[PDB]
Amino acid sequence: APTWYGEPSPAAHWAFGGKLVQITPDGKGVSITNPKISGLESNTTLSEALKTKDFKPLINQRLVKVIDDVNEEDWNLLEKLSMDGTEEFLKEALAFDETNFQPEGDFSLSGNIEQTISKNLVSGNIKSAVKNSLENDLLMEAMVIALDSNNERLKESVKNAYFAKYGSKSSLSRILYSISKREVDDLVENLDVSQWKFISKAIQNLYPNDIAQRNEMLIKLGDRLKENGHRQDSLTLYLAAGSLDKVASIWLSEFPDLEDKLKKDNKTIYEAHSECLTEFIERFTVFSNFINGINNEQLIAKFLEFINLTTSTGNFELATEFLNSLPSDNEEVKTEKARVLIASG
Amino acid sequence: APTWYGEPSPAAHWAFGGKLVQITPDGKGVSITNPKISGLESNTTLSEALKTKDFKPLINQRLVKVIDDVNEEDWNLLEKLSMDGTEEFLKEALAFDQIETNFQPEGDFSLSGNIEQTISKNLVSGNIKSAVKNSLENDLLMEAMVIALDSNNERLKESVKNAYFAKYGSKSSLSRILYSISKREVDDLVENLDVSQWKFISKAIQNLYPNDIAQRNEMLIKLGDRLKENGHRQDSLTLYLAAGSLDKVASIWLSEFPDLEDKLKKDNKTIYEAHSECLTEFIERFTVFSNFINGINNEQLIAKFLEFINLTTSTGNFELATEFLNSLPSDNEEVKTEKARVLIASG
Amino acid sequence: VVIANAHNELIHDAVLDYYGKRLATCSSDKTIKIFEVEGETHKLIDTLTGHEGPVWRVDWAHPKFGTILASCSYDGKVLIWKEENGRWSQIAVHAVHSASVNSVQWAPHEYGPLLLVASSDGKVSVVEFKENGTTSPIIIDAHAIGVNSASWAPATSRKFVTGGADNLVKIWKYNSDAQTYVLESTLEGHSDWVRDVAWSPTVLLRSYLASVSQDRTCIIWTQDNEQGPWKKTLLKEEKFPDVLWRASWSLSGNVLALSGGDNKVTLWKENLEGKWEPA
Amino acid sequence: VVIANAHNELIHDAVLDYYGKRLATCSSDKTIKIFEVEGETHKLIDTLTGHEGPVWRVDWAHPKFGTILASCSYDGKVLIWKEENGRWSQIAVHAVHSASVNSVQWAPHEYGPLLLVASSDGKVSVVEFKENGTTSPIIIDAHAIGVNSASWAPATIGTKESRKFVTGGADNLVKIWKYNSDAQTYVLESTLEGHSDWVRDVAWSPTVLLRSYLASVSQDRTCIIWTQDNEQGPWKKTLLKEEKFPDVLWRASWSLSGNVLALSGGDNKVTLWKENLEGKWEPAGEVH
C-alpha cells in the first residue's frame, strides 16, 4: 500500500569534494563516502611532478597519448626541452646548419678625371681626392682612398654614397646598410620570415647588453613568424624573450578547435571538456616551468575551472597549489581559497 | 855689305803670361810688355762677376750674341735664374697649371643564393673577419670594402686593398697610381709613368721624402735622366738643379761640347778662334750655373778648366787664373805645378 | 566513514554543508543533529529542538549569509537555524501552509537568502528575510493533492521545478507583470506521485532535470535551449524494484545519485547516445 | 816696363825665365847680367864674367833643374851658370867648337838638362850633364859655311827616337834632324830649300794642334813658314808675306799658346803674325 509520509530511504546527497552522504539501511546511521567514478581520477602525476618538478613521466604520458599532430609537437618541444634544459635548447634551436700585383711597363694618366684625382693624392690632399672621385663613378677608388685615412666623416661620406645607389639593387647591400648603421628595424620588419634565424642573430648581436630591447625585438619577430606560418618557430623566439603571455594567448585561441577534435573522438560533452582543460593545464604548467615568466583574464577564468574539477576529485592539495598561483586579488580566487581551506582543514 | 856678327836687332822672345821681351832701339836697354792681340782680351766681366757674385752683366753679354738655340735657352734659363733666384725658380717650374646620400629601405626583400646568405651569416654572427674573405673569394669587391671600411682592423683592412690592386691596377692608370701611394712608394711613377706628367712625379717625390733629402735627390735625378733621354733637355736641367746635381749638368754640357765647337768652326773661325770661344763660353755658362746650384772630380771637366787656365794666363790675368786653379783638386800634380808657376809669376 | 545511531527514531535527511565537512540530520524524533566528520571519526555538536512533528528535510545555506540551516516538518512549518558565537538558535519561523512541508531549499547565493518551500497543501512558497527580520513571501497554488519537492534552477530569469502528487512535474519562472512565479511548462510522464525533483547545476547549454516517482521510474528531462521543449528520457527501460524517493546531482560531472526504496543507491552518468548508464 | 842701360855695349839677347820673371841679358862687353823684374821696377842681381868675346845668346833651363842659364859667345865656348842662394857661379864649360857658337837652347824638360848648340864651324853639339857634372857630347857636321840656329821640336805627346830639332845655316838651308838609336846620334830627316841667303834663325812652334810649324828667317829678307801634316810627309813652304821685308830678319819666336809668331828685323822693328782661315799669315795685333 502507498503512504503519505515517513517511508525509509537512503536520501542520498552529493557534497563538495565529491562526497556522497546517505542513510544506513538500519535507518539510524549516516554514511559519507567518496564514490569511484570511472573516468574521474585525482591527478597524481601532476601533483607528484609539480612537487618533484620532474615532468619526465607526465610528459611521457601526454606524448604517448597525444591527440592531433600539432599537439604532438608541443609535447615533443617539451619532451626535449625536458632533457636538454632551457638554455641548451635555445642554442641548438637558434644556431645554423688574392694579393700581390706587380706593376710593369709604361703607362700614363689618361683623361682629366684621373689626372685631377692623382694630383690631389700626392699633394697630400686626401680629402679632395674622394670628392673628385664620388663626383664621378669612381666609387671603388673613392672607397680605396678612404680605407686609408682616419678621418671618420670622410671615411663615412662614401658608405652613405655606396648605399645611396646600391642598397636597393642588392639584398646583401640592404643588410650591410643595417649592420653598418647599427639597426635591425629593417630586417625585423621586411627581411623574409624564412631567414628568421638570421634576424634572430641580428638582435642578439646589436643588443647584447640591453635585454629589455633584445626582448622587445625578439617578440616583434615572434608575432611576425606566428602570423606568417611559422608557429613552431615563433614559440622558440617567445621562449627566449620570456613572454609566457604570447604563448598563453596562442594556446587559448587554439583551445576551441582542440576541444572539438576531442568531442568527435567519441567522448561526451564532459569527457571532451574535461580532457581538454587538463591537457592545456598540464601543457601550460610544464612550459611555464622552463621559461622566464597571471594577468590574462581567460587564462585565470580557465584556471578557476580546473580547480573545481580537481576539488571534485578530492585532491584538495593539487587544487590549492593552483589556487596559490592565481592573483589573490581575484574574489572568485579568494572565495575558493577559503572554501578549499575549510573543506580540507 | 852683309856681316857675320854683332848686328843690332830687337831679339824678341815671347814669355809666360803673354809677355814680349825685346832689346830697346838704343840697343842698351830691355823692354818687357804685354802686346795687344786682336780677339785676345783679359776676361774682365768674368773676373768682376766672380768677384762680385753678380752675373747679370755676364749673362746679358752672353745673351746678346748667343750661338745655337739650345744654348740660347740655356742662357735664357740662367737669366731667369739670376733674377728670381734658385728657390723661386724651382717653385715656379714645378708648380701645376657634398654629394648624394639618400637611402630608405622599402618593402619586403630576402637573401637569395648561397653567397648573399653566407656573408650576412658572418656579419650578424659578429664574424667580420670571415665575411670579408667570402666577399673576396667571390667577386664582391665593393662589398668587402664597405665592410672593412667599418672595421679598425689593419691586416684585414688591407687584404681588401691588395685585392683591388691585383685586378684593377693593370687595367686602370688611376688604379696604378693609387697602388704606389697606398704602398708609400714612387719607384713605379719615377720609372714608368709618362715622362709628360713629370711634374706629378716630382711633386710626388717631394711628398714622400720631405725629411730624406738624399732619397729625394736620388729620385729627382733618376726622373731627371729619363726626361733627358726622352727629349726633355730643359726639364732635365730643372730636376737636376732641384737635386743639386752639378755632375749631370756638366755631362749634358760636356757632351754637347764637340758639336758646339763645330758650328763655331763653320762660322768662318780659325782652329784657335773656334776652340777659344767655345771654351770660354763653356766656362762662363758653367761658372754661372755653378753659382745657383748646391755643389771638381770629373776628369774631362778638369782638363778643360786647365785649358781655360792656359788661355787665361796668356791674357795676363794671373788673378782670374788663380781663382780657377783653386777650384781644382790640389791633388793633381798638374794643378799643383800650375799653381806654382802662376804664384811665382804673379806674386 | 559511518556514524551509526545518530538518532533512535528513523532518519529522513542528512546533508553536508558548503564545505562538505559539517553534517546535519533530521528524523521522527522531531529533532536535528549537527555533526563534524573527519577521517573515520565524528563528534555530535548539538541537537536542534522545536518541531512539533517528524522533520522531513534540511538545507544548508550559502556561507556568505552566515552558518544557517533550514528545516521543514509534518508540522507544516519551516524553521531556520543559526550558529552565532558557537551556539545554534531558532532565528525565524515560516508557516503559511496548512499541511506537511516536505521540502525546503536555499536559492542560489546570487538571489540572496531566499527559501523554496513545497507542501502537501498543494502550495509552494518563496521566502526572503527582510531588512528587519520578518517575512513577506510569495504563495502559489502549484499542484493538486500535494507538492512533495521543489528545486531551484541554476542562476542565469529565475526558475524552479516542482513535483506534485498529481503525477506532474512543473517548471516555474518569475514574472514582473505578475510579481509572482508563473507556470512555464507542465511535464507529463509519471503514472504515480512524484516524490522528488532535482534541477542539475550543470552549466552546459542543455538543462537537466531528474524527477523520481512512486511508479518506480526515474525520468531525466532535458531542454536544449529556450526554443526546445522538455524531452522525456527514462533513466532505464525496465522499472526499478521499489519506489524511487530522491534524486541528487553532483556539483560537477553532472552525475545523478538515485535513492531507492530497496534502500539502495545507484549512480548514473550520460553517454554519447544521450542515454544513462552506471557511473 | 823698361830697364835702361843694362850694359854700355850693345845687347844681343834678353830672355825671361820659365815664370817670365827673371831676366838674363848678354852684350858685346862679354858679360851676362841677371835681373829680377817685378812691376815697373827691376833690380840687378849679378853680372856673369868669363866669356872672352861677345856673348850672342842665352837660354833659361827648366825650373825643375833649379836656376840655371846657358850662354854662348864669339869665343866658341858655352858656359853653364847656376844660382845657389842669391849667388851665381860658373858651373860647367862646353868648349868643343873651332869657331863662334851662335845659339844655345835647353831641350824640352822631359829629356833632362839637354842643351842644343849651333856653331859657325858648321857643327851642332847636343850636351847633357852626367851624374857627377861633366859631359859626353854628340857632335855632327850640319851645314857648310856655318850654323846660326838650332831649336828643338816639342816633346812627343819617353822614346828617345822621337826627338827632333831644326837647324839653320849660312848655306841657306833649313835642315831637320832626328835621333837614331842604332847610329847613337842625330841624323838628317830633311833639307828644306827656300831661302837664297844665310838662314839666321829657326824656331819650332810648340803648338799642340795636328800641324807642326817651323819659321825660318833669312838675310834674304824673308820668313818661310814650314808646315807638315804627316809624320813622314814632306814639309810645305809658305812665305810669311809675298814681298821681301825692308831689311834682314834676325829672329823669330812663337808664343806659348795661340801660335802667334814674333819677328825681329834690321829696321829694328818687331811684327806679330797669326794664321787665318785661308791658311795664310796676317798681323796679330794692330799693324804699324
UniProtKB/Swiss-Prot annotation, chain B:
What is the predominant subcellular site recorded for this chain?
membrane
Alphabetized UniProt keyword annotations:
Cytoplasmic vesicle, Endoplasmic reticulum, ER-Golgi transport, Membrane, Phosphoprotein, Protein transport, Repeat, Transport, WD repeat
Going by the entry's taxonomy, the superkingdom of the source organism is recorded as Eukaryota
The Gene Ontology biological process annotation of the record reads: COPII-coated vesicle budding; COPII-coated vesicle cargo loading; endoplasmic reticulum organization; positive regulation of ER to Golgi vesicle-mediated transport; positive regulation of protein exit from endoplasmic reticulum; protein transport
| WD repeat placement | 13-33
- Where is the protein found, in the record's own terms? Cytoplasmic vesicle, COPII-coated vesicle membrane; Endoplasmic reticulum membrane
Instruction: Provide GO CC annotations from the record.
Output: COPII vesicle coat; endoplasmic reticulum; endoplasmic reticulum exit site; endoplasmic reticulum membrane; mating projection tip
Record-level Gene Ontology MF annotations: structural molecule activity
What this protein is reported to do is described as: Component of the coat protein complex II (COPII) which promotes the formation of transport vesicles from the endoplasmic reticulum (ER). The coat has two main functions, the physical deformation of the endoplasmic reticulum membrane into vesicles and the selection of cargo molecules.
Kindly state the subunit structure of this protein. The COPII coat is composed of at least 5 proteins: the SEC23/24 complex, the SEC13/31 complex, and the protein SAR1. SEC13 and SEC31 make a 2:2 tetramer that forms the edge element of the COPII outer coat. The tetramer self-assembles in multiple copies to form the complete polyhedral cage. Interacts (via WD 8) with SEC13. Interacts with EMP24, ERV25, SEC16 and SHR3.
Q: Misc remark for this entry?
A: Present with 1840 molecules/cell in log phase SD medium.
The family this protein is said to belong to: Belongs to the WD repeat SEC31 family.
Protein name per the record:
Protein transport protein SEC31
Of the intact sequence, the residues represented are 373 to 745 of 1273
From Swiss-Prot, chain C:
Cysteine pairings via disulfide bonds? none
Pfam short name (any one): WD40
Signal peptide residue numbers: none
Q: Which InterPro entries match?
A: Sec13/Seh1_fam, WD40/YVTN_repeat-like_dom_sf, WD40_repeat_dom_sf, WD40_rpt
Principal localisation: membrane
* Cross-referenced PROSITE patterns: WD_REPEATS_2, WD_REPEATS_REGION
> Superkingdom of the source?
Eukaryota
Please provide, alphabetically and separated by semicolons, the GO molecular function terms listed in this UniProt record: structural molecule activity
Give coiled-coil spans as residue ranges.
Answer: none
Keyword Disulfide bond among UniProt keywords: no
Where in or outside the cell? Cytoplasmic vesicle, COPII-coated vesicle membrane; Endoplasmic reticulum membrane; Nucleus, Nuclear pore complex; Vacuole membrane
Q: What is the effect of changing residue 253 to D?
A: Growth inhibited above 34 degrees Celsius
Gene Ontology CC: cell periphery; COPII vesicle coat; endoplasmic reticulum; endoplasmic reticulum membrane; nuclear envelope; nuclear pore; nuclear pore outer ring; Seh1-associated complex
> Topologically, how does it sit relative to the membrane?
Peripheral membrane protein
**Which terms are listed as keywords in the entry?**
Cytoplasmic vesicle, Endoplasmic reticulum, ER-Golgi transport, Membrane, mRNA transport, Nuclear pore complex, Nucleus, Protein transport, Repeat, Translocation, Transport, Vacuole, WD repeat
Q: Where are the WD repeats?
A: 6-45, 50-91, 96-137, 142-182, 189-231, 239-278
Write out the GO biological process terms. Answer: COPII-coated vesicle budding; ERAD pathway; mRNA transport; nuclear pore localization; nucleocytoplasmic transport; positive regulation of DNA-templated transcription; positive regulation of ER to Golgi vesicle-mediated transport; positive regulation of protein exit from endoplasmic reticulum
UniProt function note: Functions as a component of the nuclear pore complex (NPC) and the COPII coat. It is one of 5 proteins constituting the COPII coat, which is involved in anterograde (ER to Golgi) double-membrane transport vesicle formation. First the small GTPase SAR1, activated by and binding to the integral ER membrane protein SEC12, exchanges GDP for GTP and recruits the heterodimer SEC23/24, which in turn recruits the heterotetramer SEC13-SEC31. The polymerization of COPII coat complexes then causes physically the deformation (budding) of the membrane, leading to the creation of a transport vesicle.
- Which miscellaneous remark does the UniProt record hold? Present with 21400 molecules/cell in log phase SD medium.
Q: How does it assemble?
A: The basic repeat unit of a COPII coated vesicle is composed of 5 proteins: the small GTPase SAR1, the heterodimeric SEC23-SEC24 complex, and the heterotetrameric SEC13-SEC31 complex. This repeat unit polymerizes to induce membrane deformation into a transport vesicle. Component of the nuclear pore complex (NPC). NPC constitutes the exclusive means of nucleocytoplasmic transport.
Family under the similarity heading: Belongs to the WD repeat SEC13 family.
**Record-given protein name:** Protein transport protein SEC13
**Species assigned in the record:** Saccharomyces cerevisiae (strain ATCC 204508 / S288c)
